Design an enzyme around this catalytic site. Structure first.
Site, PDB file in Angstrom:
ATOM      1  N   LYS A 297       0.033   2.797 -10.293  1.00 39.02           N
ATOM      2  CA  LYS A 297      -0.002   1.244  -9.260  1.00 39.02           C
ATOM      3  C   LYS A 297      -0.450   0.855  -9.873  1.00 39.02           C
ATOM      4  CE  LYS A 297      -2.567   1.482  -5.337  1.00 39.02           C
ATOM      5  NZ  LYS A 297      -3.325   2.469  -4.049  1.00 39.02           N
TER       6      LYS A 297
ATOM      7  N   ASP B 141      -9.628   0.318   5.264  1.00 44.99           N
ATOM      8  CA  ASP B 141      -9.025   0.191   5.144  1.00 44.99           C
ATOM      9  C   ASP B 141      -7.356   1.085   6.086  1.00 44.99           C
ATOM     10  OD1 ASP B 141      -8.669  -2.738   4.721  1.00 44.99           O
ATOM     11  OD2 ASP B 141      -9.836  -2.105   2.746  1.00 44.99           O
TER      12      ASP B 141
END
Ligand SMILES: COc1ccc(-c2ccc3[nH]c(=O)c4nnn(-c5ccc(N6CCNCC6)c(C(F)(F)F)c5)c4c3c2)cn1
Ligand SMILES: COc1ccc(-c2ccc3[nH]c(=O)c4nnn(-c5ccc(N6CCNCC6)c(C(F)(F)F)c5)c4c3c2)cn1
EC number: 2.7.11.1
Lengths: 286, 300
Positions: free
Chosen positions: A116, A204
């Site tokens: 990532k 989220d």
């Protein structure tokens, strides 16, 4: 998967000097880079770095000079990771997180992992926030992983790069069939409670951050801005996450339930302390 | 409303407190020898000052198997910002706390003439060095976006000044919407919120935390936006989801609180793009200037 491009130690020194200068300057002049790196040789290197798109040159009325690019920042992190035998080759991007790009990478033995790359931020804000964003994720992944949460196993970190275990699954948003929707719905709901039980709210929680494997097990791959349960408005954030889950399952799978959890009934029993400790340890090195 | 002027502090004491702040940028905990070097008092009563700062709870000291030193506290960080604002005549007195934001505490403050303002103190970073930087960054971003939004006639408070993690803004004569239980026309108030979401999206922003806690209702039932910590760009890969989430939060609150429902809620597809140089570009420009001015980059 492609091997990293070769670069001379001289070029690498200048690229590193641009990054060092960027900590306190939005734009780094050639003169400063020369000072840090230790000048018409320096200019030759800079010209080559611009051609390779690793750095960019900019002119503004107050100052003119160079800045690191996403590609240039990526190269520093990947080369460092390459040197530690963690990552040797990088594949293509398979997706994104709220503040990150996700890739597949492989080590020397060809064992695959997830990479990532965090992008957050102003030039100085970008360099600092991207690094900090990655550190937080690695620190929290480690802490959550130690408490047997469904998160990938963290392998390594550098700058804005995080390397973790690669889950054989797909984002829940791309899933249109599941063996038992009630079963997956319950796993997600139980996950929210478990996070609340450890003092966290995702903030989220959605089809985009949840990955489903062949056995229909959910893995949490993105947690950029979690909220503490000690927050004055923690209940609202908790309720929002639950409703988002309920919304998706109703829309995608036509499944509804009246057994929605309540925030007040949640009790506590620690990841944040461990994660902060990990963050402090990592900060000592940088 | 109990507003009190800041306690006095000597030039020496302020120097040491300032030295701790400077030291905290490169150290999670700051050693005493370093603080003395940085402060460089002419006569060297540095240890005398630190203990008094510890006694006054402005700083805290720690020892570990690996390290030892001092750190600024919330009160100490607050004092530096407020003392600084006071010397520049922006704020002389501080009242009671009236509420919170996602990453901030909100207070009432007053200047010399007794004119009242809103003060926001940002707290972010729960590491010592991240706490110092993120709080500054949070305040800077807030002031920068408030300025950018206000100049484009958005319903936000007028930013007056800032320092460190502190932002001073116009004080809105209103209460948070969550505390409102009666409204003359709920349909009208609902329209203001939806229009605000459209206007932000039209300018390339999604709030991401749009709720009853962030909206202030004044005497004429007009809405003002007072907290926008983590906005999302409309160019974001999942922007449509974030846009819809904010809309649903508004619809949810009105059904629960006022039993009001409407089918004239906006859609992400209808959003337009104004001038390329919009709020984000303007806000970024302000952010770069404030970063250049930051006291951490210059000698004491
Ligand atoms: C931590 O492990 C993982 C695994 C997958 C992902 C991830 C995240 C967001 C994605 N978004 C997408 O739009 C998408 N489209 N395909 N796709 C995806 C998912 C799994 C996979 N594989 C994962 C490894 N085993 C084979 C399937 C791939 C790949 F085959 F290209 F490697 C692509 C994603 C995706 C993956 C993240 N972390
Ligand atoms: C930017 O301007 C403002 C104004 C008010 C606020 C705000 C935010 C969260 C609050 N949460 C609360 O639980 C609360 N309780 N009382 N209260 C409040 C609201 C308006 C006000 N006043 C505003 C100035 N004219 C008189 C009423 C006060 C005051 F009396 F202390 F000044 C307190 C708040 C609050 C205010 C924020 N920004």
């Amino acid at each position: 998967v492609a091997k990293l491009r070769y670069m001379s130690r001289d070029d690498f020194r200048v690229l590193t000097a641009v990054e060092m200068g960027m900590k306190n300057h939005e734009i780094v002049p050639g003169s400063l880079i020369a000072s840090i790196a230790s000048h018409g040789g320096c200019n030759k290197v800079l010209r080559e770095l611009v051609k390779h798109k690793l750095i960019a040159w900019e002119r503004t009325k107050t100052v003119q000079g160079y800045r690191l690019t996403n590609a240039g920042y990526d190269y520093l992190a990947l080369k460092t990771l390459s040197s530690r035998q963690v990552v040797e080759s990088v594949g293509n991007q398979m997706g994104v997180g709220k503040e990150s790009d996700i890739y597949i990478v492989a080590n020397e033995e060809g064992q695959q992992f997830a990479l990532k790359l965090h992008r957050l931020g102003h030039n100085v804000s970008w360099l600092y926030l991207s690094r900090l964003s990655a550190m937080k994720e690695f620190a929290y992944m480690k802490a959550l992983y130690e408490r047997k949460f469904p998160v990938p196993k963290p392998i390594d970190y550098n700058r804005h790069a995080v390397v973790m275990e690669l889950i054989n699954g797909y984002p829940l948003c791309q899933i249109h069939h599941v063996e038992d929707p009630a079963s997956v719905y319950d796993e997600a709901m139980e996950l929210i409670v478990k996070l609340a039980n450890h003092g966290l709210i995702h903030g989220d929680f959605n089809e985009f951050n949840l990955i489903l494997d062949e056995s229909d097990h959910i893995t949490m791959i993105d947690f950029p801005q979690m909220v503490s349960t000690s927050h004055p408005n923690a209940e609202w954030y908790f309720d929002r996450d639950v409703k988002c889950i309920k919304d998706f399952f109703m829309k995608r799978f036509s499944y509804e339930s009246e057994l929605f959890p309540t925030f007040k009934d949640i009790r506590r029993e620690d990841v944040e302390v461990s994660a902060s400790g990990y963050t402090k340890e990592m900060q000592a090195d940088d």
